[PDB]
Each structure stands twice: as structure tokens, then as C-alpha cells.
Amino acid sequence: GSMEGILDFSNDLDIALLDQVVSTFYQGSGVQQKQAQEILTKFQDNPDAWQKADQILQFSTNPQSKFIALSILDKLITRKWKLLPNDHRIGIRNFVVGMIISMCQDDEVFKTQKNLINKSDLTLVQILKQEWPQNWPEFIPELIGSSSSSVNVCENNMIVLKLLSEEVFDFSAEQMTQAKALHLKNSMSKEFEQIFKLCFQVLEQGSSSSLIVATLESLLRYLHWIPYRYIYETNILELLSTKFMTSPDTRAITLKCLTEVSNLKIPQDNDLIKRQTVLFFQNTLQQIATSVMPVTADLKATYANANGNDQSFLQDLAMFLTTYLARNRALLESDESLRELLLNAHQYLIQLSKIEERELFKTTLDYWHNLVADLFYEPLKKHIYEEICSQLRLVIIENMVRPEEIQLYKSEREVLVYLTHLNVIDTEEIMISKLARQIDGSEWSWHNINTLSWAIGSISGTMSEDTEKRFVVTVIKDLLGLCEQKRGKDNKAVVASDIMYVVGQYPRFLKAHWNFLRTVILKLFEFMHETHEGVQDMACDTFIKIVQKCKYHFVIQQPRESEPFIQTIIRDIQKTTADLQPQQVHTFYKACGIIISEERSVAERNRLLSDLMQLPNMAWDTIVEQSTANPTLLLDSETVKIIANIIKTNVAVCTSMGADFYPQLGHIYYNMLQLYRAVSSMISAQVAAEGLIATKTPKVRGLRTIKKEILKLVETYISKARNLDDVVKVLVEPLLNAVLEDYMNNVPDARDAEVLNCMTTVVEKVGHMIPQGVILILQSVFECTLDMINKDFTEYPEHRVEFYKLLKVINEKSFAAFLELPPAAFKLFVDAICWAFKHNNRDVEVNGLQIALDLVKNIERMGNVPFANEFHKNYFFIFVSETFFVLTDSDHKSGFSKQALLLMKLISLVYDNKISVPLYQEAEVPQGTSNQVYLSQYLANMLSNAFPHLTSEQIASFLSALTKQCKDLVVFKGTLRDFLVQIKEVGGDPTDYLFA
Amino acid sequence: PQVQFKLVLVGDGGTGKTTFVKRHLTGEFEKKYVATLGVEVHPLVFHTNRGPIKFNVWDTAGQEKFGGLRDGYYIQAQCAIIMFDVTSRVTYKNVPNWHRDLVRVCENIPIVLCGNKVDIKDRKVKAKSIVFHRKKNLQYYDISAKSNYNFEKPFLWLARKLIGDPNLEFVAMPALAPPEVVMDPALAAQAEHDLEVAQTTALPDEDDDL
Amino acid sequence: STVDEMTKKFGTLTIHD
Amino acid sequence: HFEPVVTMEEDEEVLYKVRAKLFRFDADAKEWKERGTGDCKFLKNKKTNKVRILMRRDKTLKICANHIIAPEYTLKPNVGSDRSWVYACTADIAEGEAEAFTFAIRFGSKENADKFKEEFEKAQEINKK
Ligand SMILES: Nc1nc2c(ncn2[C@@H]2O[C@H](COP(=O)(O)OP(=O)(O)OP(=O)(O)O)[C@@H](O)[C@H]2O)c(=O)[nH]1
Ligand SMILES: [Mg+2]
Ligand code: NA
Secondary structure, X not given: OHHHHOOOOOOOOOHHHHXXXXXXXXXXXXXXXXXXXXXXHHHHOXXXXXXXHHHHHHHOOOHHHHHHHHHHHHHHHHHOOOOOOHHHHHHHHHHHHHHHHHHHHOHHHHHHOHHHHHHHHHHHHHHHHHHOOOOOOOHHHHHHHHHHHOHHHHHHHHHHHHHHHHHHHHOHHHHOOHHHHHHHHHHHHHHHHHHHHHHHHHHHHOOOHHHHHHHHHHXXXXXXXXXXXXXXXXXXXXXXXHHHHHOHXXXXXXXXXXXXXXXXXXXXXXXXXXXXXXXXXXXXXXXXXXXXXXOOOOHHHHHHHOOOOHHHHHHHHHHHHHHHHHHHHHHXXXXXXXXXXXXXXXXXHHHHOOOOOHHHHHHHHHHHHHHHXXXXXOOOOHHHHHHHHHHHHHHHHHOOOXXXXXXXXXXXXXXXXXXXXXXXXXXHHHHHHHHXXXXXXXXXXXXXXXXXXXXXXXXXXXXXXXXXXXXXXXXXXXXXXXXXXXXXXXXXXXXXHHHHHHHHOOHHHHHHOHHHHHHHHHHHHHHOOOOOOOHHHHHHHHHHHHHHHOHHHHHOOOOOOOOOHHHHHHHOHHHHHOOOOHHHHHHHHHHHHHHHHHOXXXXXXXXHHHHHOHHHHHHHHHHHHHHHXXXXXXXXXXXXXXXXXXXXXXXXXXXXXXXXXXXXXXXXXXXXXXXXXXXXXXXXXXXXXXXXXXXXOHHHHHHHHHHHHHHHHHHHHHHHOOOHHHHHHHHHHHHHHHHHXXXXXXXXXXXXXXXXHHHHHHHHHHHHHOHHHHHHHHHHHHXXXXXXXXXXXXXXXXXXHXXXXXXXXXXXXXXXXXXXXXXXXXXXXXXXXHHHHOOOOHHHHHHHHHHHHHHHHHHHHHOOOHHHHHHHHHHHHHHHHHHHHHHHOXXXXXXXXXXXXXXXXXXXXXXXXXXXOOOOOOOOOOXXXXXXXXXXXXXXXXXXXXOOOOOHHHHHHHHHHHHHOOOOHHHHHHHHHHHHXXXXXXXXXXXXXXXX | OOOEXXXXXXXXXXXXXXXXXXXXXXXOOOOOOOOOOOEEEXXXXXXXXXXXXXXXXXXXXXXXXXXXXXXXXXXXXXXXXXXXXXXXXHHHHOHHHHHHHHHHHOOOOOEEEEEEOOOOXXXXXXXXXXXXXXXXXXXXXXXXXXXXXXXXXHHHHHHHHHHOOOOOOEOOOOOOOOXXXXXXXXXXXXXXXXXXXXXXXXXXXXXXXX | OHHXXXXXHHXXXXXXX | OOOOOOOOOOOEEEEEEEEEEEEEEEOOOOEEEEEXXXXXXXXXXXXXXXXXXXXXXXXXXXXXXEEEOOOOOOOEOOOOOOOEEEEEEEEEOOOOOOXXXXXXXXXXXXXXXXXXXXXXXXXXXXXXX
């Protein structure tokens, strides 16, 4: 009601009404708050609102209103500043400087209004970016002058100089032109002598901790860019490493400053700098030991208790020690007197590494990796760290992670493998004695036995074979004893899994010892009958895991065995898998497939293959005989389950056998494609009988699974197929007749996106051999799929994704299929590519731009012929402007690189005279006119209309530069990014595009 | 109730900020991307062993054109969650920017960094690459609003820092004995009607495990 | 023999008491 | 002598426990919305002999279902599921105050869903007494 008064700009703004609306937002709730939010937003986005800012900043008492006043000003300064008259520019500068000084004088406001003060400074820093130093040359001297008088002003000036350093050096790349970044960087660099003078004085004369923290906070930012000489050739390292490590308010920021010092660019051959780099580290550790905690402090307990800012401090300490030691530990390894310092710093890292905090642990593990790698390769280092490394072994083992947490596991294993090589005797000891403390029950728990098992398995293949043998036997003996000891089948199952986990990780041992391998596999088969949760999965996982590693020992005949063991597995395959779930059986069959692929006798592999596929081929044949003679039996959902499992079983075997699967595929191929058609009819019939809801029913989803697993089997085979003559001659023509018409003639909801996926793999592997088949694929799926996906960007996500993969691979492999498209259909091809540009979905966006780029390469490759000439006259300026549209709309930033590359390619064609026809039509430009001139003219006009706030000079400059730079890619990208900054503001400098 | 904290949720458009909150409010999984205009405040209560804790969750707008007051929303926030998308590299590139604007208003508060959408198979921002949190003292969690992987964690961590107890756990809220409401004739019509539409509108994600 | 005695212990591994 | 160093489901018995996902029908839109995933329990009160559904969400443990398994309710099948039931509930207090819902609850398999319908009817036969 009354709150929408402030939107009426025809009157004076009621400041009390603003504060109502502002209070209602920040302190109210529900409907009240939400109505206030929309009015603040409409107020703030009102282009005239900045005029009523100095009004708010002097009259309003509410800091939140004042903050929003600065937010409106901040918007004007970064975007419409050069459009203002020059008296406004000075006027605004004056009351931003005047307000800041005004608030610092008042100690009440200085203390209680930190948020409003810091926003004022950031708003001041935006003015400097526009005006400094060309129109404010005396800013830095007048800043330093005010800093002697008032301590509050001095502290605030450090905040300003911090924010200034950030916006110039840390956050300029995206937000400024290259030329303006360089200007502000050189301008800060030129006056830093005077700024450092002030900081160093304030740090020595040190009266006030808030001032000293603010100065140290600014210093941290300077260290990203300043030359080393300011740190080393002054006294400032002594102050940081001693004075500011004692007091706790300064300690935190000082440690972050020294962390960045350790990364400074330093001459690597100067013995005073080397002593100075040792010195500050020595001091820093000395202050930690006497002022914070000694080397023996239990940092796990401290961190866990979470008092004050202890957790942040311990994090910063880790960062400091790792950063320095990674760069500089070499400086401490040769001197006898620095040995204690070296080992004390590493002991702190050992204690830090015991902290229960994943992300911190990761940080210290990167360092441990760095070190132990170096101790494994570098001469004479390892003996120094024997005691550190021995503790690390325990730390890594006690914190081992399951293999499924992929990355943390990899880093741990790597470190533990290096520490095992460095001293095998110690590693084995630590692992065995931990096992004895699982047997005695002192450290017994499900989690603890699991971590030890993951640890023991991580160091596989690092010991000598003869030592490994003794180690594994000991470990396995003890774990067997532990299982027999324990009671209740929860406990027994945990240990059985760990026993079987560890043997799975030692394939070399399993390879050397056949008797034992055989026992382990037969034991897994007994475990495939256990109903207890997790056991059957663990049995199947371990089986295929052992099978992947030891393939040869199943496929050949061992000593004192009547046959290769693969034959023994196949004979009881019914009995072995009888209690497993269907997906678990498929893993079993997949495993059996891996083994069979090792047999290189064709007669034998094919024989083993048909033996393996016996149950599913006998189930299959009886279903084919049933459901062909009477399609009534295919409506039963139980028959649909059985058929899907047969196909899934085939996919599983085909996955592991690839090209070797052909004789099995041949057995079922034609009946399978007939089943595909029969299933298709039922889906289309059910859709007409029940409606679109039919596609959701279990009945139809069952049938669609059959189709999808059939499509998946064929895709899987063709992806890995070695004999491509037989793929073309036998498989393809039947497949296309089965799948393409069905796809085309179903309503969109009944179309399987997997049809597209399947076709992509066909075009990939054999598209070059089937030009007529590829035309058939386009006719059947192109237009009808494009209509499903060209209304919005969300609907049919899988179809949308697989659609552009198919066009990509067709455009690569059988481009001639696009030539045979009618002109109207080829126009939809161009429409579809540009449609892919506009997707946020990266999968579609990347292929959209890729297709576009390859299409241009394909047209270029045709040379001076009428199709390529007609393509440029029709579609060149479509691609140029459609590319520009996505580059400059701020909603396709992820695609910048490939957009830039596509744009450059389009421009380079005209620059190299590769288009052999006038792009301009009859009478539109003079007769003797190059494409280069018309290209500049088209773009000058295009951009002028798309961005009417740019001057003609800005545009003409940009284009002159952009076309010159169309051979150098990264420079071209630079010019594009400059243009992206300049379109966000008014009055950008056109000379910025000469930055070279 | 009386013990309540303002939380600001920031990060690029599409990362799943609102989806994450709606999952915590109602339990639902919003499939559609409907961009937040400016901000939406959502009160969100957890039951802990140290009494109940409430977050006023200011769910802010990731897109720039729908950004609204921007860092005006951060004023007097006591904690924050910075969100990105592990499938989109650019969302992680912009994390330094979201943090810059946040800490300038909120100098000293507990912040969680969240990499959403780890349920997606083709992950683009790798675990190895995620290190920005280290020097800035942010807690990091891989999460998923879809699979609920670590979905409780950010709020549990912030609760611990804000209340100042590392051992604070979430607990089972009290389950009162429910009523014996007999149904009347006057609501039998609209329940009959609503049930007809329910049965004949299929449940989402039937391929999912539960 | 140490590997064989271990293999025999492995044979009797069970989940039940 | 040496001196030493100085939920509300207590009254209820668990009859049936099953893992499940619960949806509510938003009538205004034409869509189901997830309400929670976790252990769905059937709880007989030792005082009143009254059976209720109690279902909590994983990890947060917030209540997403809390009502009496009334004799009048009937479990209908859903069009798109062989492992789900759907039914009218006149009064649920998972959010706070009593409120009507059209619920749907989906289980791991068809075999679990069938055992649910069996135990659900057993609970109704207790609540008539
Ligand atoms: N796969 C997957 N998708 C998710 C997840 N979380 C969110 N999404 C998807 O992200 C899309 C939009 O998420 P939003 O919550 O609107 O993202 P937002 O950050 O709130 O967007 P703005 O309001 O513009 O800031 C939805 O379509 C969700 O399906 C997740 O954990 N996994
Ligand atoms: Mg949102
Ligand atoms: Na391992």
C-alpha cells in the first residue's frame, strides 16, 4: 500500500518511508518482507535512483538504507560514469571522500558501522578505477598525509589500499580491458614506494592492533605482486617472524603473510637471501613452540575442541609449513645446526596430520607425497627422515579410506607405497602389530578392521615376491583365526569380506599358487549362496576382480588338473548362480567372458562361448518358439523379465568379449530383430489403447527394456567389432529396417533415445562403407527428432544429447549424406546447429560448436564449386551473427573458447580470400568490392544495432583489431574479452584494442 | 524458535541452491529450473541435542539479470553456503568472485563450500582441482540434492560453529501420538476426486532404487 | 607346507558359528 | 570409600519395519512430490493397542509420516508402479497440525510392497478392536 510510494519518482523521496521499506525487509518476515523486497529491487533498478543517493547518505539514520544508496552509486560508477557531466563526477567523488572522513572522525560510528564504512571504501575504489591517476594524481600523497593525523583514518586508508590492490591485481582479468589493467597496475607499481614507506612505519611504531591487523591485511594482498626486494632488503621479515607471531590478533594474518612470502619470486643463488629465508622460518617456529604450543601438543584434541579461532589457525599453520618446506626444505637438510628445525617443523606436520578433518588431511597428504617421492628418488635424503616416516606409516594406515572414495585412496596408496619401499621391514611390522591388536580386541571394531584391510591391500606388488609370500600368508592366517574367534554372523561376515578383499588385492600371490587360487574361487561360490546382506555382492565383485587380474590361470590347464578351470566353472554355472539376483548373474557371466577371450584358439573360444551361453540360449529358443507361434505370451510380465535377462546376459558377455562375441550374436541376431518388431507393435498398440500414460506402466516399460537392451547389445558389439565387412554385410541392413521406421512412426514419448545412440556407433565404425544407409538414418530420425527438441531447451534431455552426437559423427564420417538433403532440409540442419549454440547444457553446446566448425572445414574442402558458393551466400553471415550473439549475451560463458575458435575460422576465410563469390547480393554494394570490406561493413552495422551505446570508433577499432588478429588465437580471444567488458559500460576507450 | 541464525546461500545460476533448500524444507526434488528473482527467505529448523536451531535461509539469485540487491542481501549474515556445480567448470571458476563479495560484507563468519550434482556420472570439476577453500578456511563438502549425498553435512557443520559445540548432533524430533480423525460425508467427494487423479498420474523416477 | 596349511584353514572359513 | 567421577517411541512396539520413499500429491499442480526416504515403521502403542505409521527421513531424522492406520483407508495401485501403494489420509501430523493428504509410498521391490499391504491390513484389524 503505502510502501509503493517510493517508486513514485514524481515527488520528493520520503526518507522515513524508505527506512520502513528497508526495515520491513531486513527485520520483518513472510508476506511483509517479500513485498518490501520487490519494491527495493524496483527502486534500486530505477535508472534515476543514484540522484537521490547523497540525499539518503546525509538524511537517513539507517545503515541498511545507506548501504543500498552506495550499491546504486556503485552501479552507476562501474557502468554509466563517463556519460555523466564532469561536475557530477567531482561532486560524487567529494561526498564519498567527505562521508568516509566524516565516519572515521566519529569513534561511535567508526566502531559500530564497519559494514557501511567498508562499502563506502569499495565505492571509493570504483571511482579510482575510473579516475586515478590521470584525473586524481595527488590521491596517494593526500592519503598518506591524512594517515599521520587520525589513527581511525589511517586504519581505514589501509582497508582502501587493500581493496585497491585486490581490484587491480587479483580481480582485474575478467572485469577490465587488458590496457586498463596494465594502466592501473603500472600506476600502483609507480607509487608503491610511498605506500610501503607508510606500512613499514606503522608496523614498527605499532600503537593499535586494529590498525596493525588492517596494515597486515593490506600487506597480504601486496605480496601477490610486489618485487621481493621490499621484503628481503628491508627489516620487515624480522617483524613478521617475531613481533607479530607473539600477539594472537596479529598472529593469524601474519602466518598468511609468511605463507605468501614463501612463494615470492627470489634469486635462487644468493647466500644472504638463503640465510634470510632460513631465518624467518627459524623465528616463526620458535614463536609457535613458546607462544602457541610445543612440538608434543596433541593437536587432534585441540582442533576437535574448536575453541576460538584455533581450527583456522591450525589450518593456516599446515598451509605455512607445507608451502615453505615444499619450496625450501633443501636449505635445511645440509647444515647440522638446522637439523632440529627441519625435524620439528615435520613433527608439527605429523601432529597436524592426526587431526580429524578430511580437507586438512588432504592438504598435508599432498606435502607427504611431495616428500616421500623426493626421498625415493633423491640421493642421501631418506636417512634424515627415518623417524618422521615411521610415524607417517601409522598415520596413513590408521586413516586409510575405502577404494570407492577414488581420489583420497589414490593419494594415500601412492604415499604408502613409497613409505613401504623406503622401509619394508617397518611397514610390515606396523601392519602385523595392528593385526595383533584386532585379534586381542583392544582396537577391535568393524570400521578398524576394514581400514587395516584397505591399508594392507594398498601396498601390493611393492615387497619382493618372496617377502610378499611370507607377509600374505601371515596376514591371511591371522584373519582366518580372527573369523573363527569371533561370534555372531555379523562379525564373521565383516572379516570374511576383509579376508576376501585382501586376497583380491594380491594377484601375484594368486598367480604363483594355483591350489590356493582354486580354494578362494570355490569359497566365493559357497558365498554366492549366503542370504546375509552384502555377501553375495562381495562374492561377485571379488570374483570378477580376481578374474580380471589372473585371466591366464583359468584359461590354461594347470598341473594336476584334468582341464582348464574355466570348463569347471561353466559346468556348475546353474548350481553356482542359482541363489543370485539377475544383475549378479550378469557379472558372473561377464567374468566368465573375460576368461574365454584369453583362449586364442578359435575353435576352443567359440566352443567355450556356446557352452557358457547354454542356459540363456535354451531359455531363448523356447521363448522364440512360444511367442512367434502365439504373440499372446509376450503380454505376461514374467516372460518379459526372462527375455530382458537373456539379452542383459548377452550384453554382459559381449562387453568383456567384444569382437569374439560374433558367433553368439549370430545365433540370436535375426530372431532378436524379429522380437524387436513384435515388442514395438505391442508398445504402439498399448499407446493407442491406454493413451500416453501407457509409457509409464510396468507392462510397457518392461517391453521398452527389451528394445533398449537389444539396441545396447548391438551397439556394444559394433563398437568393438574387428570384422567390419561382416558388420556391413550381415548386421546393418537388418538393423536399420528393424529400428528406423519404428522410431519415426512412434509418437515422441514412445521413441527410444537409445536408437540414436546405437546409430551414432554404427556411423562411427562403418559410416564410410554405407553412404546409402546413412541417408536412411537421417531421413528416419533427423526432422522428427528436431521437432521434439526445438520448442524449449529442457524437454527430451537424452534425445537432445544423442541427436547432436549423431549429427557430429555423420558430419565427420559421411558428409555426403548432408549434400543429398533437399535445400529446405539442409536449412533445418543449419537451424539445428545454431540451436545447439544457445544451450546451457554443455553436452549439446560443445557438439553444436564442433559441428559448426567441422561443417565450415568440410565446405572449404570442396573448393570452388556451386554448393560451397551457395552455402556461403546463404549461411556465412548466419553463423557469424549467431556466434557473436552467444559470445556477447553473458549466458554462454562456458563455451567462450570454441565460440572464439569458430568465429576466428569464419573471419580467416574472408581474410585469406577463401570464399570465391560476392557475399553481398545484386546492387547492394559497388561492383569491385572485396569480401573483407563488406565483412567490416556488415559487422560494423550488426554491432551498432545490437549495442547502440558503443560509438562508431569503438566498433571500427574493435573490428580492425579483431580481423588483424585472426591468425593468432589467444590474442583474438583477448580482443573478444576486451569487447565483453566494453559492452557492459559507456564510453570505453577505443585505443584499448591496440594492446599488443 | 528464539535461537536463530541468518544464512546466505550464494553461487552461480543452475547450481541447485533452491533445489537443495526445498529438499530440506519439504523433502521434494524439484526437477525444473525456475530461476530465483533476487532472494527468497525460508525458515529452516533442525532438532539437536542442545535444543532446536533455526536458520533463516536467504536463497539468493545466481543469474546476474535476476540478481536483485546482490551483496545487499549479505548484511548481518551469520553464516553462508557457497554453491557450485561439479558438472560445470565455470561455476567453480566463479567461486572466488562469490567469496570476494561475501567476505567484504561478512568479515568473520563460518562458511561452507558445496560442490553439488556429484550424482552425475560425467563429473567435470575433479576432486583434485577443488582447493580454493583451503587458504580461505571454508569447510568443503561434495553434495547432491538428488541422491542426498552429504545433504545434512553443511547445516550440521554450521550448527557446530555457531552454537560453539563440536559434539552437537542432529536427533530424532518428538513423534506425538496422532489423532483418530473419523471422516465426514462433506469431504468424501473431494478426497474421492483427488485420489482418482493421483492413481492415474505416474510416480516420478520409477527406475530409481527406492 | 606353510602355504598348504593356510590353504586348508581357508577351506573351512564360514559365516556360521 | 572413594567417590566416583561425578523421541517419544518408548511406549510403542515395532510390528513391521520397511525401507521406503513417500510422496504426497500436490492437487494444485498435476504432480507428485517426494516427502521423504527412510525406515517406515508400524508402531503398536502398549497403552491403547493403536497402530500408526512412523516414517523418518535419513540423516536429518525429521518426521515425514505420522498417522493412524485407520480401518477406512484402502491401498490402491499406481498406474506407473508394481511396487507402490496410494491412499487417502484424513489426518497426518508430520508437519505440525493435522491435515489431509493423498499419499503414495514406493518400496524396493514388488515383494516388499506386497508384505506392506499384508501388514497394513493386519494393523487395521487391530484398530477396529
Ligand atoms: N542431477 C542433479 N541435478 C540437480 C541437483 N540439484 C539441483 N539440480 C538441478 O538444478 C536445476 C536448477 O536448480 P536451482 O535450485 O534452480 O538452481 P539455483 O542455484 O537455485 O538457480 P538460481 O535460482 O538461478 O540461483 C534443477 O532443474 C535441478 O534438477 C542435484 O543434486 N543433482
Ligand atoms: Mg534459485
Ligand atoms: Na586396497
